[PDB]
Design a protein around this ligand. Structure first.
Ligand SMILES: Nc1nc2c(ncn2[C@@H]2O[C@H](COP(=O)(O)OP(=O)(O)O)[C@@H](OP(=O)(O)OP(=O)(O)O)[C@H]2O)c(=O)[nH]1
Ligand SMILES: [Mg+2]
Length: 295
């Protein structure tokens, strides 16, 4: 879990061992390099390091360990200015939409999240709202069966996503479900009016339970997340994103990208994907994360 990042950032500890006032510029240049090699973006590394330099000059930081602590809390302040928990409220069912470009991990993140909720006694219905392919619903159907979830699939091939999602949330209300988890399409052709279809899913579920969707989670591959930020912002601006799922961070040496996307999007990360097994979805805790990568 970011163990590669922790190993790379550990050179900051060795550096700070021998810091003194005179060695400040050397230490920071080389702190900056360690943050940059991890995926801390240029804009925030400069702010972190310039904040450290201001606080060393004004005497607020007088030892290697104080500098290390201030680094950690400067990063924490950029992660957590925002709640990272799912807020499902009390009206039933709660509705969670998983959105994002195909390839990124929506369907697998959905099933892993369903497995967590079922471990918690939550009764979960899955909605196969990616109607592009038959194989998308069959893939989701595989997840519904090894997690104990019933699943609502489309009736015909030309079915709208909103149609399936509305049927599914209607069904979830009636059968006594706590949560309906909605898979959606992420067609990268995007001459497909993806945004439009997502807005129609949003309205369709809101007419069945006012307040739904309680969460719209944007799935972003953690390795290529810094690239598609324009696409992320479009999801957030047009649909409205309540949280991020950063996937494929298995043993990431790129832990800074978490900080960077959060800083740049202003959307909390709620879960990290760290592998392909059903349990490889971990809730995101900013303090635990900052401890994870800086020990
Ligand atoms: N290592 C790692 N891999 C992840 C993670 N999340 C998703 N993957 C993988 O990315 C691929 C795409 O996931 P999907 O869930 O189908 O993506 P999508 O719905 O957004 O289109 C899957 O593997 P696939 O090869 O495309 O298909 P399959 O493995 O399910 O057969 C899935 O296993 C993660 O956190 N860590
Ligand atoms: Mg999918």
């Amino acid at each position: 879990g970011f163990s590669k990042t922790r190993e790379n950032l550990a050179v900051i500890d060795e550096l700070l061992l021998f810091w003194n006032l005179a060695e400040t510029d050397r230490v920071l240049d080389e702190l900056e390099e360690a943050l940059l090699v991890s995926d801390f973006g240029p804009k925030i590394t400069v702010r972190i390091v310039e904040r450290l330099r201001e606080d060393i000059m004004s005497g607020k930081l007088k030892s290697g360990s104080e500098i290390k602590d201030a680094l950690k809390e400067s990063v924490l302040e950029m992660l957590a200015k925002s709640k990272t928990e799912l807020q499902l409220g009390f009206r039933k069912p709660a509705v969670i939409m998983i959105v994002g470009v195909n390839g990124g991990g929506k369907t697998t993140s959905l099933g892993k999240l369903a497995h967590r909720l079922k471990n918690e006694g939550t009764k979960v219905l899955m909605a196969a709202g990616d109607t592009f392919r038959a194989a998308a619903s069959d893939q989701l159907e595989i997840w519904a069966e090894r997690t104990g979830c019933e699943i609502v699939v489309a009736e015909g091939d030309k079915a709208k996503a909103a149609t399936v999602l509305s049927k599914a949330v209607k069904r979830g209300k009636e059968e006594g479900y706590d949560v309906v988890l909605c898979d959606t399409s992420g067609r990268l052709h995007t001459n497909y009016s993806l945004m439009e279809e997502l807005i129609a899913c949003k309205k369709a579920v809101g007419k069945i339970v006012s307040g739904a969707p309680n969460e719209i989670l944007l799935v972003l591959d953690g390795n290529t997340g810094l690239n598609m930020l324009p696409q992320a912002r479009e999801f957030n601006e047009v649909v409205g994103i309540t949280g991020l799922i950063l996937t494929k961070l298995d043993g990431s040496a790129r832990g800074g990208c978490v900080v960077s996307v959060v800083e740049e999007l202003g959307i909390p990360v709620k879960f990290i994907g760290v592998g392909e097994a059903v349990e490889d979805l971990q809730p995101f805790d900013p303090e635990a994360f900052v401890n994870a990568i800086f020990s």
